[PDB]
């Protein structure tokens, strides 16, 4: 069902959005610190199958959050992702030849989610 | 529970800084050399807990912990309040002024800040 997938994608994007907005603000002194970690994302993420690269970077995401309940949020996130692309490696994420900060990483995926939701029309 | 310092130690032109030992909680970015990314789904940093915790690992496209296929720029560290680094001019430069040349990340009223070293290295 198109609506199931849309819902899941919305829930997923809102959790990511919660983290991004939650750490990327002037009331967080750890930011600079968090921006030194190199995150990996797809160069051109567009198919739901690409959610494999987000999945492969979740423990790293949970790790940066420790500098900011993460353990529960990431768990929720991870399940939704599996629900959106299964348990098989759906893509060979040797990733972009380029890296990213959590701000970019999250910007990519939040945009990915918002886009696919509209595309599902 | 150690607190991370919001900033890097003061930067002194032509000077480098070194910690003599690392405190419970300093983190070391698992950075890689050019043409090498970190192992898929791999840890982001090592953590001092006494010894280091995680293991860095770079594939291809506490005491000073031992190398791995590291980064040729340095190691990006994250210190905790109470930590001190020591400054010394690099080669080709001498201490013009030698006010305190070490820094401690202190947490005065809320925020953390490093003590300002007073070291000056002229050509």
């Amino acid at each position: 069902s198109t609506k199931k997938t849309q819902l899941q994608l919305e829930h997923l994007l809102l959790d990511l959005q919660m983290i991004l907005n939650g750490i990327n603000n002037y009331k967080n002194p750890k930011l600079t610190r968090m921006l030194t970690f190199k995150f990996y994302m797809p160069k051109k993420a567009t198919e739901l199958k690409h959610l494999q690269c987000l999945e492969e970077e979740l423990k790293p995401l949970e790790e940066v959050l420790n500098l900011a309940r993460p353990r529960d949020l990431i768990s929720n996130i991870n399940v939704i992702v599996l629900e959106l692309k299964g348990s098989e490696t759906t893509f060979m994420c040797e990733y972009a030849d380029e890296t990213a900060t959590i701000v970019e990483f999250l910007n990519r995926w939040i945009t990915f989610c918002q886009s696919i939701i509209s595309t599902l029309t | 529970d150690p607190e991370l310092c919001d900033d890097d130690p003061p930067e002194i032109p032509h000077a480098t800084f070194k910690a003599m030992a690392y405190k419970e909680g300093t983190m070391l970015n698992c950075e890689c050399k050019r043409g090498f990314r970190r192992i898929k789904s791999g840890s982001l940093y090592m953590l001092c807990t006494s010894s280091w915790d995680n293991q860095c690992q770079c594939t291809s496209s506490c005491r000073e912990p031992p190398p791995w296929e590291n980064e040729a720029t340095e190691r990006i560290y994250h210190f905790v309040v109470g930590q001190m680094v020591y400054y010394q001019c690099v080669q080709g430069y001498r201490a013009l002024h030698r006010g305190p040349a070490e820094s401690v990340c202190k947490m005065t009223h809320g925020k953390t800040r490093w003590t300002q070293p007073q070291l000056i290295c002229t050509g």
Side-chain angles (χ1 to χ4, degrees), chain A residues 31-74:
Chain A
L31 194 48
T32 13
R33 293 291 89 199
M34 294 191 286
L35 293 170
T36 73
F37 298 102
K38 309 297 183 306
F39 266 88
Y40 295 100
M41 62 185 168
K43 356 68 205 303
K44 48 122 165 110
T46 173
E47 282 181 85
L48 223 63
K49 77 173 181 180
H50 301 185
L51 280 167
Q52 234 284 317
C53 311
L54 176 62
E55 172 182 35
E56 306 184 308
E57 284 285 81
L58 293 187
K59 216 123 230 75
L61 177 64
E62 197 193 326
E63 278 188 330
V64 181
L65 281 165
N66 291 163
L67 285 70
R69 175 176 304 303
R71 185 276 226 70
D72 276 1
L73 221 209
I74 308 294

mmCIF file of all heavy atoms in Angstrom, chain A residues 31-74:
data_model
loop_
_atom_site.group_PDB
_atom_site.id
_atom_site.type_symbol
_atom_site.label_atom_id
_atom_site.label_comp_id
_atom_site.label_asym_id
_atom_site.label_seq_id
_atom_site.Cartn_x
_atom_site.Cartn_y
_atom_site.Cartn_z
ATOM 1 N N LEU A 31 28.291 20.887 19.328
ATOM 2 C CA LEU A 31 28.189 20.889 17.864
ATOM 3 C C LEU A 31 29.505 20.791 17.085
ATOM 4 O O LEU A 31 29.715 19.827 16.340
ATOM 5 C CB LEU A 31 27.406 22.121 17.401
ATOM 6 C CG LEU A 31 26.907 22.165 15.951
ATOM 7 C CD1 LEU A 31 26.200 20.852 15.569
ATOM 8 C CD2 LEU A 31 25.963 23.350 15.793
ATOM 9 N N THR A 32 30.376 21.789 17.233
ATOM 10 C CA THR A 32 31.672 21.783 16.545
ATOM 11 C C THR A 32 32.309 20.398 16.652
ATOM 12 O O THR A 32 32.768 19.824 15.656
ATOM 13 C CB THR A 32 32.655 22.789 17.176
ATOM 14 O OG1 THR A 32 32.144 23.220 18.441
ATOM 15 C CG2 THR A 32 32.877 23.979 16.264
ATOM 16 N N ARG A 33 32.344 19.884 17.883
ATOM 17 C CA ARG A 33 32.892 18.571 18.168
ATOM 18 C C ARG A 33 32.234 17.531 17.270
ATOM 19 O O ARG A 33 32.912 16.714 16.653
ATOM 20 C CB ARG A 33 32.619 18.186 19.623
ATOM 21 C CG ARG A 33 33.343 19.007 20.681
ATOM 22 C CD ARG A 33 34.839 18.751 20.675
ATOM 23 N NE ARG A 33 35.538 19.654 19.770
ATOM 24 C CZ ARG A 33 36.763 19.440 19.298
ATOM 25 N NH1 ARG A 33 37.422 18.346 19.640
ATOM 26 N NH2 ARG A 33 37.334 20.326 18.491
ATOM 27 N N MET A 34 30.904 17.564 17.212
ATOM 28 C CA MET A 34 30.132 16.612 16.420
ATOM 29 C C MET A 34 30.355 16.731 14.922
ATOM 30 O O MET A 34 30.157 15.782 14.174
ATOM 31 C CB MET A 34 28.644 16.777 16.726
ATOM 32 C CG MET A 34 28.264 16.398 18.149
ATOM 33 S SD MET A 34 26.467 16.288 18.392
ATOM 34 C CE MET A 34 26.069 18.016 18.387
ATOM 35 N N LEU A 35 30.783 17.909 14.497
ATOM 36 C CA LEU A 35 31.003 18.168 13.094
ATOM 37 C C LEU A 35 32.363 17.747 12.585
ATOM 38 O O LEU A 35 32.715 18.063 11.452
ATOM 39 C CB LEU A 35 30.799 19.661 12.819
ATOM 40 C CG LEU A 35 29.370 20.185 12.992
ATOM 41 C CD1 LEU A 35 29.358 21.709 12.925
ATOM 42 C CD2 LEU A 35 28.473 19.571 11.909
ATOM 43 N N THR A 36 33.135 17.050 13.414
ATOM 44 C CA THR A 36 34.464 16.607 13.003
ATOM 45 C C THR A 36 34.418 15.170 12.513
ATOM 46 O O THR A 36 35.358 14.691 11.869
ATOM 47 C CB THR A 36 35.474 16.668 14.148
ATOM 48 O OG1 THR A 36 35.210 15.607 15.073
ATOM 49 C CG2 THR A 36 35.386 17.996 14.860
ATOM 50 N N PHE A 37 33.327 14.482 12.828
ATOM 51 C CA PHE A 37 33.147 13.097 12.407
ATOM 52 C C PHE A 37 32.717 13.003 10.952
ATOM 53 O O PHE A 37 31.782 13.692 10.523
ATOM 54 C CB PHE A 37 32.114 12.427 13.291
ATOM 55 C CG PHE A 37 32.523 12.362 14.717
ATOM 56 C CD1 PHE A 37 31.998 13.252 15.645
ATOM 57 C CD2 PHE A 37 33.467 11.435 15.132
ATOM 58 C CE1 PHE A 37 32.409 13.218 16.970
ATOM 59 C CE2 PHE A 37 33.890 11.389 16.453
ATOM 60 C CZ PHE A 37 33.363 12.282 17.377
ATOM 61 N N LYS A 38 33.411 12.159 10.191
ATOM 62 C CA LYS A 38 33.083 11.972 8.787
ATOM 63 C C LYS A 38 32.019 10.888 8.647
ATOM 64 O O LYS A 38 32.213 9.730 9.038
ATOM 65 C CB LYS A 38 34.323 11.595 7.980
ATOM 66 C CG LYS A 38 35.510 12.520 8.177
ATOM 67 C CD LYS A 38 35.236 13.932 7.713
ATOM 68 C CE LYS A 38 36.491 14.810 7.855
ATOM 69 N NZ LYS A 38 37.084 14.797 9.244
ATOM 70 N N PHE A 39 30.879 11.296 8.101
ATOM 71 C CA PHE A 39 29.757 10.406 7.875
ATOM 72 C C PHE A 39 29.710 10.073 6.381
ATOM 73 O O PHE A 39 30.176 10.854 5.543
ATOM 74 C CB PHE A 39 28.467 11.081 8.383
ATOM 75 C CG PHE A 39 28.108 10.690 9.803
ATOM 76 C CD1 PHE A 39 28.623 11.392 10.889
ATOM 77 C CD2 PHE A 39 27.326 9.568 10.052
ATOM 78 C CE1 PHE A 39 28.363 10.981 12.200
ATOM 79 C CE2 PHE A 39 27.060 9.151 11.360
ATOM 80 C CZ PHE A 39 27.586 9.863 12.432
ATOM 81 N N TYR A 40 29.177 8.903 6.047
ATOM 82 C CA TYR A 40 29.114 8.478 4.657
ATOM 83 C C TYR A 40 27.685 8.367 4.165
ATOM 84 O O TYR A 40 26.832 7.774 4.830
ATOM 85 C CB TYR A 40 29.835 7.133 4.501
ATOM 86 C CG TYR A 40 31.326 7.211 4.770
ATOM 87 C CD1 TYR A 40 31.858 6.806 5.997
ATOM 88 C CD2 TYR A 40 32.199 7.730 3.811
ATOM 89 C CE1 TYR A 40 33.224 6.921 6.267
ATOM 90 C CE2 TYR A 40 33.567 7.846 4.067
ATOM 91 C CZ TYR A 40 34.075 7.442 5.295
ATOM 92 O OH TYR A 40 35.431 7.557 5.544
ATOM 93 N N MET A 41 27.420 8.941 2.997
ATOM 94 C CA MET A 41 26.080 8.897 2.427
ATOM 95 C C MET A 41 26.113 8.607 0.929
ATOM 96 O O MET A 41 27.162 8.685 0.296
ATOM 97 C CB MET A 41 25.373 10.230 2.670
ATOM 98 C CG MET A 41 26.069 11.391 2.021
ATOM 99 S SD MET A 41 25.294 12.934 2.451
ATOM 100 C CE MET A 41 26.527 14.108 1.840
ATOM 101 N N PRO A 42 24.959 8.253 0.348
ATOM 102 C CA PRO A 42 24.906 7.965 -1.080
ATOM 103 C C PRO A 42 25.022 9.267 -1.846
ATOM 104 O O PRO A 42 24.482 10.298 -1.433
ATOM 105 C CB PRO A 42 23.530 7.335 -1.257
ATOM 106 C CG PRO A 42 23.235 6.765 0.074
ATOM 107 C CD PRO A 42 23.696 7.866 0.986
ATOM 108 N N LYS A 43 25.734 9.199 -2.963
ATOM 109 C CA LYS A 43 25.952 10.334 -3.847
ATOM 110 C C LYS A 43 24.605 10.750 -4.428
ATOM 111 O O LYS A 43 24.252 11.932 -4.435
ATOM 112 C CB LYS A 43 26.907 9.909 -4.967
ATOM 113 C CG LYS A 43 27.436 8.462 -4.808
ATOM 114 C CD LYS A 43 26.334 7.396 -4.990
ATOM 115 C CE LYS A 43 26.672 6.087 -4.262
ATOM 116 N NZ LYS A 43 27.966 5.477 -4.668
ATOM 117 N N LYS A 44 23.859 9.764 -4.915
ATOM 118 C CA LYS A 44 22.541 10.008 -5.490
ATOM 119 C C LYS A 44 21.505 9.033 -4.938
ATOM 120 O O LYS A 44 21.168 8.040 -5.580
ATOM 121 C CB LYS A 44 22.593 9.904 -7.022
ATOM 122 C CG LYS A 44 23.307 8.664 -7.564
ATOM 123 C CD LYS A 44 22.405 7.812 -8.461
ATOM 124 C CE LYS A 44 23.213 6.796 -9.270
ATOM 125 N NZ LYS A 44 23.012 5.381 -8.843
ATOM 126 N N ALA A 45 21.008 9.315 -3.739
ATOM 127 C CA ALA A 45 20.003 8.455 -3.130
ATOM 128 C C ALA A 45 18.646 8.851 -3.686
ATOM 129 O O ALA A 45 18.265 10.026 -3.658
ATOM 130 C CB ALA A 45 20.017 8.594 -1.621
ATOM 131 N N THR A 46 17.918 7.859 -4.188
ATOM 132 C CA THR A 46 16.616 8.108 -4.783
ATOM 133 C C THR A 46 15.665 6.918 -4.705
ATOM 134 O O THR A 46 14.446 7.081 -4.734
ATOM 135 C CB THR A 46 16.770 8.497 -6.252
ATOM 136 O OG1 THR A 46 15.475 8.573 -6.861
ATOM 137 C CG2 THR A 46 17.624 7.465 -6.978
ATOM 138 N N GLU A 47 16.201 5.714 -4.638
ATOM 139 C CA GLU A 47 15.314 4.577 -4.545
ATOM 140 C C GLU A 47 15.248 4.167 -3.105
ATOM 141 O O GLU A 47 16.192 4.389 -2.346
ATOM 142 C CB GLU A 47 15.795 3.411 -5.413
ATOM 143 C CG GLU A 47 15.495 3.588 -6.893
ATOM 144 C CD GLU A 47 15.969 2.418 -7.725
ATOM 145 O OE1 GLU A 47 15.225 1.418 -7.850
ATOM 146 O OE2 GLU A 47 17.103 2.497 -8.246
ATOM 147 N N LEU A 48 14.113 3.588 -2.738
ATOM 148 C CA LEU A 48 13.883 3.132 -1.387
ATOM 149 C C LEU A 48 14.968 2.127 -1.051
ATOM 150 O O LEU A 48 15.270 1.897 0.115
ATOM 151 C CB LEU A 48 12.510 2.466 -1.300
ATOM 152 C CG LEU A 48 11.577 2.731 -0.115
ATOM 153 C CD1 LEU A 48 11.154 4.198 -0.036
ATOM 154 C CD2 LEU A 48 10.366 1.844 -0.296
ATOM 155 N N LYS A 49 15.565 1.532 -2.077
ATOM 156 C CA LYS A 49 16.603 0.535 -1.855
ATOM 157 C C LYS A 49 17.861 1.158 -1.265
ATOM 158 O O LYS A 49 18.645 0.475 -0.604
ATOM 159 C CB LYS A 49 16.931 -0.210 -3.161
ATOM 160 C CG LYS A 49 17.803 0.524 -4.170
ATOM 161 C CD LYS A 49 18.180 -0.406 -5.331
ATOM 162 C CE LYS A 49 19.074 0.282 -6.364
ATOM 163 N NZ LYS A 49 19.450 -0.613 -7.501
ATOM 164 N N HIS A 50 18.036 2.458 -1.488
ATOM 165 C CA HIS A 50 19.202 3.171 -0.977
ATOM 166 C C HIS A 50 19.182 3.310 0.549
ATOM 167 O O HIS A 50 20.203 3.646 1.153
ATOM 168 C CB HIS A 50 19.293 4.562 -1.601
ATOM 169 C CG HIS A 50 19.390 4.559 -3.094
ATOM 170 N ND1 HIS A 50 19.582 5.711 -3.823
ATOM 171 C CD2 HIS A 50 19.299 3.554 -3.997
ATOM 172 C CE1 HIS A 50 19.603 5.420 -5.111
ATOM 173 N NE2 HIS A 50 19.432 4.117 -5.245
ATOM 174 N N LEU A 51 18.032 3.055 1.177
ATOM 175 C CA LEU A 51 17.939 3.154 2.631
ATOM 176 C C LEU A 51 18.907 2.186 3.306
ATOM 177 O O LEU A 51 18.994 2.120 4.535
ATOM 178 C CB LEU A 51 16.507 2.890 3.094
ATOM 179 C CG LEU A 51 15.554 4.086 2.951
ATOM 180 C CD1 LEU A 51 14.109 3.640 3.126
ATOM 181 C CD2 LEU A 51 15.908 5.157 3.973
ATOM 182 N N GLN A 52 19.645 1.451 2.483
ATOM 183 C CA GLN A 52 20.621 0.498 2.966
ATOM 184 C C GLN A 52 21.803 1.287 3.533
ATOM 185 O O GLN A 52 22.380 0.908 4.555
ATOM 186 C CB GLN A 52 21.078 -0.415 1.815
ATOM 187 C CG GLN A 52 20.946 -1.937 2.061
ATOM 188 C CD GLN A 52 22.028 -2.508 2.977
ATOM 189 O OE1 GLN A 52 23.201 -2.161 2.855
ATOM 190 N NE2 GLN A 52 21.639 -3.404 3.880
ATOM 191 N N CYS A 53 22.146 2.400 2.889
ATOM 192 C CA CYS A 53 23.271 3.216 3.342
ATOM 193 C C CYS A 53 22.977 3.951 4.652
ATOM 194 O O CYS A 53 23.894 4.237 5.440
ATOM 195 C CB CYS A 53 23.658 4.219 2.261
ATOM 196 S SG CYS A 53 23.844 3.472 0.609
ATOM 197 N N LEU A 54 21.702 4.267 4.880
ATOM 198 C CA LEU A 54 21.326 4.929 6.113
ATOM 199 C C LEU A 54 21.461 3.861 7.180
ATOM 200 O O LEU A 54 21.997 4.090 8.257
ATOM 201 C CB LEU A 54 19.879 5.426 6.060
ATOM 202 C CG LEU A 54 19.373 6.061 7.364
ATOM 203 C CD1 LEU A 54 20.207 7.279 7.671
ATOM 204 C CD2 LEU A 54 17.916 6.446 7.246
ATOM 205 N N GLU A 55 20.981 2.672 6.869
ATOM 206 C CA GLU A 55 21.076 1.616 7.846
ATOM 207 C C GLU A 55 22.516 1.316 8.250
ATOM 208 O O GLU A 55 22.801 1.127 9.430
ATOM 209 C CB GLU A 55 20.410 0.343 7.327
ATOM 210 C CG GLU A 55 20.642 -0.849 8.232
ATOM 211 C CD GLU A 55 20.035 -2.114 7.691
ATOM 212 O OE1 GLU A 55 20.040 -2.291 6.452
ATOM 213 O OE2 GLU A 55 19.563 -2.936 8.506
ATOM 214 N N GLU A 56 23.427 1.278 7.282
ATOM 215 C CA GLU A 56 24.822 0.958 7.583
ATOM 216 C C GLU A 56 25.540 2.029 8.389
ATOM 217 O O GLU A 56 26.657 1.811 8.846
ATOM 218 C CB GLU A 56 25.597 0.672 6.287
ATOM 219 C CG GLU A 56 24.961 -0.411 5.405
ATOM 220 C CD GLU A 56 25.777 -0.763 4.164
ATOM 221 O OE1 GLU A 56 26.158 0.153 3.398
ATOM 222 O OE2 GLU A 56 26.024 -1.970 3.945
ATOM 223 N N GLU A 57 24.897 3.176 8.580
ATOM 224 C CA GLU A 57 25.503 4.271 9.337
ATOM 225 C C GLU A 57 24.794 4.597 10.664
ATOM 226 O O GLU A 57 25.078 5.620 11.291
ATOM 227 C CB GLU A 57 25.573 5.528 8.451
ATOM 228 C CG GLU A 57 26.680 5.495 7.402
ATOM 229 C CD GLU A 57 28.061 5.721 8.013
ATOM 230 O OE1 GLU A 57 28.641 4.753 8.552
ATOM 231 O OE2 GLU A 57 28.559 6.866 7.967
ATOM 232 N N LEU A 58 23.899 3.716 11.100
ATOM 233 C CA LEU A 58 23.145 3.935 12.335
ATOM 234 C C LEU A 58 23.924 3.847 13.639
ATOM 235 O O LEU A 58 23.718 4.678 14.519
ATOM 236 C CB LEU A 58 21.940 2.991 12.415
ATOM 237 C CG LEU A 58 20.858 3.258 11.366
ATOM 238 C CD1 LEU A 58 19.624 2.371 11.636
ATOM 239 C CD2 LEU A 58 20.507 4.765 11.376
ATOM 240 N N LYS A 59 24.793 2.853 13.795
ATOM 241 C CA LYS A 59 25.559 2.778 15.030
ATOM 242 C C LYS A 59 26.445 4.033 15.115
ATOM 243 O O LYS A 59 26.670 4.570 16.209
ATOM 244 C CB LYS A 59 26.415 1.515 15.085
ATOM 245 C CG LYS A 59 26.509 0.946 16.490
ATOM 246 C CD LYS A 59 26.026 -0.511 16.559
ATOM 247 C CE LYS A 59 25.003 -0.747 17.691
ATOM 248 N NZ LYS A 59 23.644 -0.195 17.374
ATOM 249 N N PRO A 60 26.971 4.508 13.966
ATOM 250 C CA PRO A 60 27.812 5.715 13.969
ATOM 251 C C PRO A 60 26.969 6.928 14.404
ATOM 252 O O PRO A 60 27.457 7.825 15.102
ATOM 253 C CB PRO A 60 28.260 5.829 12.514
ATOM 254 C CG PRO A 60 28.338 4.394 12.081
ATOM 255 C CD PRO A 60 27.102 3.777 12.689
ATOM 256 N N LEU A 61 25.712 6.956 13.952
ATOM 257 C CA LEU A 61 24.780 8.025 14.295
ATOM 258 C C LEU A 61 24.521 7.958 15.795
ATOM 259 O O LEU A 61 24.536 8.978 16.484
ATOM 260 C CB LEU A 61 23.449 7.856 13.546
ATOM 261 C CG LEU A 61 22.326 8.867 13.849
ATOM 262 C CD1 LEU A 61 22.738 10.267 13.423
ATOM 263 C CD2 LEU A 61 21.058 8.458 13.121
ATOM 264 N N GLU A 62 24.279 6.757 16.308
ATOM 265 C CA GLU A 62 24.035 6.617 17.733
ATOM 266 C C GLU A 62 25.265 7.066 18.515
ATOM 267 O O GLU A 62 25.148 7.627 19.596
ATOM 268 C CB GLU A 62 23.716 5.178 18.092
ATOM 269 C CG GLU A 62 23.075 5.054 19.449
ATOM 270 C CD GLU A 62 23.034 3.627 19.942
ATOM 271 O OE1 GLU A 62 22.882 2.709 19.102
ATOM 272 O OE2 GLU A 62 23.142 3.428 21.171
ATOM 273 N N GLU A 63 26.446 6.821 17.963
ATOM 274 C CA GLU A 63 27.679 7.211 18.627
ATOM 275 C C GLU A 63 27.875 8.719 18.741
ATOM 276 O O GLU A 63 28.285 9.212 19.792
ATOM 277 C CB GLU A 63 28.877 6.573 17.929
ATOM 278 C CG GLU A 63 29.122 5.146 18.372
ATOM 279 C CD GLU A 63 30.417 4.590 17.837
ATOM 280 O OE1 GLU A 63 30.836 5.015 16.740
ATOM 281 O OE2 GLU A 63 31.014 3.722 18.510
ATOM 282 N N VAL A 64 27.601 9.459 17.672
ATOM 283 C CA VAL A 64 27.733 10.916 17.729
ATOM 284 C C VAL A 64 26.728 11.511 18.720
ATOM 285 O O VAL A 64 27.018 12.506 19.389
ATOM 286 C CB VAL A 64 27.493 11.573 16.365
ATOM 287 C CG1 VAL A 64 27.672 13.066 16.478
ATOM 288 C CG2 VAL A 64 28.470 11.042 15.377
ATOM 289 N N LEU A 65 25.546 10.901 18.800
ATOM 290 C CA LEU A 65 24.503 11.358 19.709
ATOM 291 C C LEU A 65 24.953 11.286 21.168
ATOM 292 O O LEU A 65 24.488 12.056 22.005
ATOM 293 C CB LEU A 65 23.230 10.537 19.505
ATOM 294 C CG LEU A 65 22.372 10.927 18.294
ATOM 295 C CD1 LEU A 65 21.376 9.829 17.993
ATOM 296 C CD2 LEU A 65 21.643 12.227 18.573
ATOM 297 N N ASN A 66 25.864 10.371 21.474
ATOM 298 C CA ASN A 66 26.361 10.257 22.837
ATOM 299 C C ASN A 66 27.059 11.542 23.266
ATOM 300 O O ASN A 66 27.230 11.780 24.457
ATOM 301 C CB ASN A 66 27.319 9.079 22.960
ATOM 302 C CG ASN A 66 26.615 7.745 22.819
ATOM 303 O OD1 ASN A 66 27.258 6.717 22.590
ATOM 304 N ND2 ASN A 66 25.286 7.748 22.961
ATOM 305 N N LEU A 67 27.470 12.365 22.304
ATOM 306 C CA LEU A 67 28.128 13.635 22.620
ATOM 307 C C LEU A 67 27.094 14.736 22.884
ATOM 308 O O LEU A 67 27.448 15.849 23.275
ATOM 309 C CB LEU A 67 29.049 14.087 21.472
ATOM 310 C CG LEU A 67 30.402 13.411 21.216
ATOM 311 C CD1 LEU A 67 30.189 11.992 20.689
ATOM 312 C CD2 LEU A 67 31.213 14.242 20.214
ATOM 313 N N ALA A 68 25.821 14.423 22.656
ATOM 314 C CA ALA A 68 24.740 15.387 22.861
ATOM 315 C C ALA A 68 24.179 15.274 24.273
ATOM 316 O O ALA A 68 24.895 14.904 25.201
ATOM 317 C CB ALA A 68 23.640 15.151 21.843
ATOM 318 N N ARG A 69 15.887 9.134 24.292
ATOM 319 C CA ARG A 69 17.037 8.277 24.552
ATOM 320 C C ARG A 69 17.656 7.726 23.270
ATOM 321 O O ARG A 69 17.083 6.846 22.636
ATOM 322 C CB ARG A 69 16.638 7.102 25.446
ATOM 323 C CG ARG A 69 17.753 6.079 25.670
ATOM 324 C CD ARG A 69 17.338 4.974 26.648
ATOM 325 N NE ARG A 69 16.896 5.492 27.947
ATOM 326 C CZ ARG A 69 17.626 6.268 28.754
ATOM 327 N NH1 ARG A 69 18.856 6.633 28.407
ATOM 328 N NH2 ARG A 69 17.126 6.684 29.917
ATOM 329 N N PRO A 70 18.843 8.227 22.875
ATOM 330 C CA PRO A 70 19.515 7.755 21.656
ATOM 331 C C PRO A 70 19.365 6.262 21.374
ATOM 332 O O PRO A 70 18.937 5.884 20.291
ATOM 333 C CB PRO A 70 20.979 8.178 21.874
ATOM 334 C CG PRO A 70 21.055 8.531 23.348
ATOM 335 C CD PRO A 70 19.722 9.150 23.605
ATOM 336 N N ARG A 71 19.709 5.431 22.356
ATOM 337 C CA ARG A 71 19.616 3.975 22.245
ATOM 338 C C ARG A 71 18.230 3.506 21.772
ATOM 339 O O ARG A 71 18.106 2.503 21.060
ATOM 340 C CB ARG A 71 19.949 3.339 23.604
ATOM 341 C CG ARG A 71 20.027 1.804 23.648
ATOM 342 C CD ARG A 71 18.653 1.125 23.817
ATOM 343 N NE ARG A 71 18.672 0.059 24.826
ATOM 344 C CZ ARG A 71 18.805 0.266 26.137
ATOM 345 N NH1 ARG A 71 18.930 1.502 26.612
ATOM 346 N NH2 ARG A 71 18.822 -0.762 26.977
ATOM 347 N N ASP A 72 17.187 4.233 22.165
ATOM 348 C CA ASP A 72 15.826 3.884 21.787
ATOM 349 C C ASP A 72 15.395 4.493 20.471
ATOM 350 O O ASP A 72 14.676 3.864 19.695
ATOM 351 C CB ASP A 72 14.852 4.296 22.886
ATOM 352 C CG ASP A 72 14.746 3.258 23.969
ATOM 353 O OD1 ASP A 72 15.455 2.229 23.869
ATOM 354 O OD2 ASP A 72 13.957 3.459 24.920
ATOM 355 N N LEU A 73 15.854 5.714 20.223
ATOM 356 C CA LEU A 73 15.514 6.421 19.009
ATOM 357 C C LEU A 73 16.098 5.698 17.826
ATOM 358 O O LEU A 73 15.403 5.440 16.848
ATOM 359 C CB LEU A 73 16.067 7.844 19.041
ATOM 360 C CG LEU A 73 15.168 8.972 18.513
ATOM 361 C CD1 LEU A 73 16.060 10.069 17.978
ATOM 362 C CD2 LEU A 73 14.208 8.464 17.418
ATOM 363 N N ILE A 74 17.379 5.368 17.911
ATOM 364 C CA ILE A 74 18.053 4.689 16.820
ATOM 365 C C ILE A 74 17.442 3.309 16.591
ATOM 366 O O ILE A 74 17.331 2.843 15.455
ATOM 367 C CB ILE A 74 19.557 4.554 17.104
ATOM 368 C CG1 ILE A 74 20.138 5.917 17.459
ATOM 369 C CG2 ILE A 74 20.274 3.987 15.878
ATOM 370 C CD1 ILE A 74 20.115 6.909 16.336
#
